[PDB]
């Protein structure tokens, strides 16, 4: 199941990078640190909270329309 | 050289979801498996290359034992006796890829192809003979 | 990859010399190249001979070989011609239907947009060809604007007066408000905008949106913008319902709004409704009336120009909650009493070229006579609504067609909405005119309104007409009738009360001369639409089709609320004018 | 290679040679019916060779091009495909801590900074109305990201402070509504 | 291949062939008739196979010398670019503070690394953290390379302007922190 977390972390960092996040140095540094550390985790009980911390980054902007894109 | 320093980042890398879904449907990547994902594309922040120069920091001036080094070089030279070598003219040079960068200055104007056409064989030979003195 | 404009068949072949680069199916593309001068074929790569130093660009001379396209001179031994067997080789070759007749598409894609026939084909062809015609006409106008030369400020003689040096080898655009320039400030290596400007003969009298202190170096060019592709039709399909759909009428309405209640219900009975509003009938009164009639409905107010939507906001501010209204402005001074750039607000006010992608219960089109099929298609691509309300008037002016030189554009060819209501009749009609006295109303009711326009006021006995040819003089891009102005001057001396009137004429040069001679405020008929004054003085100044435009003349003499004086050169319209005639002094 | 005219020529030659062989006519006459027969394959096994090469040029030309119509189209729609894939996998993950914030952010509640993992750091959240205030905050506690956070501060959008008991439903409009709330992980 | 002379010989031999074949004289007469065309089919062979294989080499020659001309134009373009780059970077040399230090050399040779140290008129320091900022670039004026420099501009990693009042100890965590401080050599 940890593979799912690592793959979705890869996808989340991809969309974050393409949302021009890397135009702010420190935010991109923290996101890169979280993404690199999630890929190296060995238990699912730390990857999940680092994953939620990394998702809180994208849930703070206003470039991703959320209600539309969770059309289910 | 410029009025501003440049910070270079590295991209996270793309995900091929269809292959992963196919593999998972085939009973791969379960818990307690001898095979698992360990190779990824790792991203970097702004200060990456200037952090790699602090690894060239590791080089130190070293004095070698000269007599042992001379004997060792004489012994090592015997592993390269079956080969042959020497200088060649500009006609005999074989270049693998001509679409690669030519360096610091010169990348602002073209690839290595441009500088190998422009100069004829005589110019290349003149440059090579200049480099010998 | 796209869709064939004549077949909807999937295709990748685009006519290369054809300006909008439309997708043409193999049979359609073959006919378009064989029946016109278009010989460039664009596909994923061009079907151009990739041999060095070759100029062969006609597909009927090209052969496919190896992995590329060659001319006959440069082709390899093994190949098959790209143009053979009544079709051009390309994507989606098997899936191809073709068309029986390609004449309309060829005519539109080959016309220079200088004949009324081009517009009649554009507004009478199929919906997809209608869209392509709109695209190519706007693109042609945009490129023609670039054909005009650069005008640079050589000397600033004074304020509101300049001296301009014009680019050599290029035509100078006509100097009227229909040609909106833009200044540019000279910098180290580039240029920066200094605002939008208009010009008129003096020296040249300039009127910029933002005042500045421009000096020698600034230059003016007519701003051009990228012409976007079209996908949505000019009109959504008609739907008729048995009940009001998606709307809830209020149970309490005021007598200011009772007359349109029946029309407000019909708006709910159909997918889209066409509304015709005579001068001073309450087009703003109606459209804002749909808002209070359906309080819970989300309504987007749209219009071609900034002026009309602001006037809608002005009437909306009078009747609608300021907190539920929003004025969308792109990144020109406009309405600034609503919150700016709030798409999700209940009441959204914005223009055609700046509308966001959103949905609404009702979408209101005002001033539809100045609307084109392009503006019709764009908003429908931007707004999806349960009900659609088009407000305008065929007897009023259209959007100017600069490229048009031959013939006159009838109202039923202005756009799709104008075509229906000129043929099938308007869905609703307000028969009450409140602004002009009966004599103007009766004159304009017979002329253009099928005698359907009723007056609210009585006869005012201040509507006066005179037949006077005078002497017509022409400058670079307009006309002047000084004796016609001189008659007005003599009229003012004998009737001093008429010096509160506003001078109107179909020519800007006539207004410029009359302003210095008479001192009255001056307005062109095109710019006078949407305004009103107590008294107006109208000088035809010519007998040309421009001056004799039955839509324009309807607009011209109907800006007066009490009285009017009309110095006429055309006998036909003079006889139609039910005013009290005079003898020439 | 059947719909060609020199196919009819080859068929006529084959019929003539079949008649010659079945009849046993002569020695030079059947050589004439094999003279103009083996040549009939020299303008058949040739003209049916360039064209047969032409066809495979076609099927594979139509291929180096669908995959460019495809390559140049796929790199022109990245920004929506990546996002939809992200949310599909996120929904497939089915984790409560992620789902809580997903729903909070879809309706009203977005944080103003990275949610901290340590038990000390500060968290600032935006509450748009009172309805979400009921679901998330109950008294002096704040349940968010499947964790407990004690409120230390709530201030309205006009940067004015507000207390933790006034907030109710009778001062419903007597509160500015984009409340912001500061909390500390318990 | 139609305007070749052998086409006429082939055509006339074939015309005589069909004429006498319709006439049908005899084998003793048609022997020469069907041998002349058999050698005419051999002539047109030769010369038509001596021609269509030269159109390939001529085309190849045209393409090759097209390519060589293209290369020779690109060479001139790159030559002009290199020369103008040299000439525009020479004009920043500050040819008065460099001449003095060169003239003091015994032979005229001076190490390269001391040319910007004693001649350049702009200094750009890169600062990783506030503590390193305190010991090196403190205040509006500092000293380095046995000279006195005065601060004019400070930017962060995002290349946005930072005032000298914002660089404190407690406010440091709110800054992108490869700070680039540029200054001019004061006199
Ligand atoms: Zn050597
Ligand atoms: Zn075309
Ligand atoms: Zn077609
Ligand atoms: Zn060619």
UniProtKB/Swiss-Prot annotation, chain A:
Domain RdRp Nsp7 cofactor stretches: 1-72
Subcellular localization(s) per the UniProt record: Host cytoplasm, Host perinuclear region; Host cytoplasm; Host endoplasmic reticulum
Superkingdom in the source lineage: Viruses
Function statement: Plays a role in viral RNA synthesis. Forms a hexadecamer with nsp8 (8 subunits of each) that may participate in viral replication by acting as a primase. Alternatively, may synthesize substantially longer products than oligonucleotide primers.
Subunit structure: Interacts with nsp8 and nsp12 to form the replication-transcription complex (RTC): nsp12, nsp7, two subunits of nsp8, and up to two subunits of nsp13. Eight copies of nsp7 and eight copies of nsp8 assemble to form a heterohexadecamer dsRNA-encircling ring structure.
Protein name: Non-structural protein 7
Species of the source: Severe acute respiratory syndrome coronavirus 2
Parent-protein residues present: 3861 to 3932 of 4405
Curated annotation (Swiss-Prot), chain E:
Compartments in which it is found: Host cytoplasm, Host perinuclear region; Host cytoplasm; Host endoplasmic reticulum
Residue ranges constituting the RdRp Nsp8 cofactor domain according to the UniProt record: 1-187
Taxonomic superkingdom: Viruses
LRR repeats: 30-57
UniProt-annotated stretches for the region Disordered: 1-73
Subunit structure and binding partners: Interacts with nsp7, nsp13 and nsp12 to form the replication-transcription complex (RTC): nsp12, nsp7, two subunits of nsp8, and up to two subunits of nsp13. Eight copies of nsp7 and eight copies of nsp8 assemble to form a heterohexadecamer dsRNA-encircling ring structure.
Function, as annotated: Plays a role in viral RNA synthesis. Forms a hexadecamer with nsp7 (8 subunits of each) that may participate in viral replication by acting as a primase. Alternatively, may synthesize substantially longer products than oligonucleotide primers. Interacts with ribosome signal recognition particle RNA (SRP). Together with NSP9, suppress protein integration into the cell membrane, thereby disrupting host immune defenses.
Name of the molecule in the record: Non-structural protein 8
Organism whose genome encodes this protein: Severe acute respiratory syndrome coronavirus 2
Lineage: Viruses, Riboviria, Orthornavirae, Pisuviricota, Pisoniviricetes
């Amino acid at each position: 199941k940890m593979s799912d977390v690592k793959c979705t972390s890869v996808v989340l960092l991809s969309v974050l990078q393409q949302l021009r996040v890397e135009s702010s140095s420190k935010l991109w540094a923290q996101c890169v640190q979280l993404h690199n550390d999630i890929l190296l985790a060995k238990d699912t009980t730390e990857a999940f909270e680092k994953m939620v911390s990394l998702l809180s980054v994208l849930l703070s902007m206003q470039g991703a329309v959320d209600i539309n894109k969770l059309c289910e | 050289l410029t009025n501003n320093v440049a910070f270079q980042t590295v991209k996270p890398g793309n995900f091929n979801k269809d292959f992963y879904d196919f593999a998972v449907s085939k009973g791969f990547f379960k818990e307690g498996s001898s095979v698992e994902l360990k190779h990824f594309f790792f991203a970097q922040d702004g200060n990456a290359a200037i952090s790699d120069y602090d690894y060239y920091r590791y080089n130190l001036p070293t004095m070698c034992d000269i007599r042992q080094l001379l004997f060792v070089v004489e012994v090592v030279d015997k592993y390269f006796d079956c080969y042959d070598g020497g200088c060649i003219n500009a006609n005999q040079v074989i270049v693998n890829n001509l679409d690669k960068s030519a360096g610091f200055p010169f990348n602002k104007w073209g690839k290595a192809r441009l500088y190998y056409d422009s100069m004829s064989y005589e110019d290349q030979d003149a440059l090579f003979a200049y480099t010998k003195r | 990859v796209g869709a064939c404009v004549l077949c909807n068949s999937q295709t990748s072949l685009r006519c290369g010399a054809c300006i909008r680069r439309p997708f043409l199916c193999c049979k359609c593309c073959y006919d378009h190249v064989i029946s016109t001068s278009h010989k460039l074929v664009l596909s994923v790569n061009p079907y151009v001979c990739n041999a060095p130093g070759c100029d062969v660009t006609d597909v009927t001379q090209l052969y496919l070989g190896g992995m590329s396209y060659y001319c006959k001179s440069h082709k390899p031994p093994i190949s098959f011609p790209l143009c053979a067997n009544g079709q051009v080789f390309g994507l989606y070759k098997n899936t191809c239907v073709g068309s029986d007749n390609v004449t309309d598409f060829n005519a539109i894609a080959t016309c220079d947009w200088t004949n009324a026939g081009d517009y009649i084909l554009a507004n009478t062809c199929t919906e997809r060809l209608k869209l392509f015609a709109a695209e190519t006409l706007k693109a042609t106008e945009e490129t023609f604007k670039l054909s005009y030369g650069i005008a640079t400020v050589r000397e600033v003689l004074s304020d509101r007066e300049l001296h301009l040096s014009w680019e050599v080898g290029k035509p100078r655009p006509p100097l009227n408000r229909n040609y909106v320039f833009t200044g540019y400030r000279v910098t180290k290596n580039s240029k920066v905008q200094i605002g939008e400007y208009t010009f008129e003969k003096g020296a040249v009298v300039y009127r910029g949106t933002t005042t500045y202190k421009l000096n020698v170096g600034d230059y003016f060019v007519l701003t051009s913008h990228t012409v976007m592709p079209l996908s949505a039709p000019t009109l959504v399909p008609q739907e008729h319902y048995v009940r009001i759909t998606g709307l809830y009428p209020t149970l309490n309405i005021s007598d200011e709004f009772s007359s349109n209640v029946a029309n407000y219900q019909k708006v709910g009975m159909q997918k889209y409704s066409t509304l015709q509003g005579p001068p001073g009938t309450g087009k703003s009164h109606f459209a804002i009336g749909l808002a209070l009639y359906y309080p819970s409905a989300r309504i987007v107010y749209t219009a071609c120009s900034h002026a009309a939507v602001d006037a809608l906001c002005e009437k909306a501010l009078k009747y609608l909650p300021i907190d539920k209204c929003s004025r969308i402005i792109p990144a020109v001074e406009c309405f600034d009493k609503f919150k700016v750039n709030s798409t999700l607000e209940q009441y959204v006010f914005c223009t055609v070229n700046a509308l966001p992608e959103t949905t609404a219960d009702i979408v209101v089109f005002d001033e539809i006579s100045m609307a084109t099929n392009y503006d019709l298609s764009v908003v429908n691509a931007r707004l999806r609504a349960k009900h659609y309300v088009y407000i305008g008037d065929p007897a009023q002016l259209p959007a100017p067609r600069t490229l048009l030189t031959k013939g006159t554009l009838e109202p039923e060819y202005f756009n799709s909405v104008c075509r229906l209501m000129k043929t099938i009749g308007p869905d609703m009609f307000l028969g009450t005119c409140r602004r002009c006295p009966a004599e103007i109303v009766d004159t304009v009711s017979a002329l253009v309104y099928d005698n359907k326009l009723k007056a609210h006021k009585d006869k005012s006995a201040q509507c006066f007409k005179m037949f006077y040819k005078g002497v017509i003089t022409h400058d670079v891009s307009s006309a002047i009738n000084r004796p016609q102005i001189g008659v007005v001057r003599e009229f003012l001396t004998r009737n001093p009360a008429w010096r509160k009137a506003v001078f109107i004429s179909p020519y800007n040069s006539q207004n410029a001369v009359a302003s210095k001679i008479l001192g009255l405020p001056t307005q062109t008929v095109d710019s006078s639409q949407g305004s009103e004054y107590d008294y107006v003085i109208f000088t035809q100044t010519t007998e040309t089709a421009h001056s004799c435009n039955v839509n324009r003349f309807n607009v011209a003499i109907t800006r007066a609320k009490v009285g009017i004086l009309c110095i006429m050169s055309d006998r036909d319209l003079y006889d139609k004018l039910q005013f009290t005639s005079l003898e020439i002094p | 290679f059947s719909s060609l005219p020199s196919y009819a020529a080859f068929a006529t030659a084959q019929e003539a040679y079949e008649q010659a062989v079945a009849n046993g006519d002569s020695e030079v006459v059947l050589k004439k019916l094999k003279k103009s027969l083996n040549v009939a394959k020299s303008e058949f096994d040739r003209d049916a060779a360039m064209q047969r090469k032409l066809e495979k040029m076609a099927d594979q030309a139509m291929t180096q091009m669908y995959k460019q119509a495809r390559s140049e189209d796929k790199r022109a729609k990245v920004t929506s495909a990546m996002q939809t894939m992200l949310f599909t996998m996120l929904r497939k993950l089915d984790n409560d801590a992620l789902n809580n914030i997903i729903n909070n952010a879809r309706d009203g509640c977005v944080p103003l900074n990275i949610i901290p993992l340590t038990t000390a750091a500060k968290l600032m959240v935006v509450i748009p109305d009172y309805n979400t205030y009921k679901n998330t905050c109950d008294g002096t506690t704040f349940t968010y990201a499947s964790a407990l956070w004690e409120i230390q501060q709530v201030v309205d959008a006009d940067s004015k402070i507000v207390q933790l008991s006034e907030i109710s439903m009778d001062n419903s409009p007597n509160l500015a509504w984009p409340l912001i709330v500061t909390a500390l992980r318990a």
